[PDB]
């Protein structure tokens, strides 16, 4: 009872940490698309 | 009603595995970023 309570806490703690780390990644993914659009338009210059 | 413990156990394990992957995903995304940033620095130097 007190045990299931802690276990369910743990599940929720881990979900939060992961959900944020997943967001930080999704953002690095937006960043990448950004640098790639940069390179594409830098290259359009010479070529 | 129980095997509730069992479900909680397995789910927690999956979540821990999920974190070790998100961690691997983060460092690789960082390696990809620094390389694109390096590539843009060369390009900017070539064009300039």
Provide a count of the helices of chain A: 1
Number of helices of chain B: 1
Q: Strand percentage of chain B, roughly?
A: under 5%
Q: What CATH architecture of chain A do you see?
A: Up-down Bundle
**Structural class of chain A, please?**
mainly alpha
How would you classify the helix and strand content of chain B by structural class?
A: mainly alpha
Largest sheet of chain B: none
**CATH fold field value of chain B:** Single alpha-helices involved in coiled-coils or other helix-helix interfaces
Q: What is the number of E strands of chain A?
A: 0
Largest sheet of chain A: none
Named CATH architecture of chain B? Up-down Bundle
Q: Indicate the percent of residues in helices of chain B.
A: over 70%
CATH topology of chain A: Single alpha-helices involved in coiled-coils or other helix-helix interfaces
The secondary-structure element order of chain B is H
Instruction: Report the C-alpha radius of gyration of chain B, rounded.
Output: 21 Å
CATH class of chain B: Mainly Alpha
Helix percent band of chain A? over 70%
Oligomer: heterodimer
Radius of gyration of chain A: 20 Å
Q: Report the count of strand segments of chain B.
A: 0
Which series of helices and strands of chain A comes N to C?
H
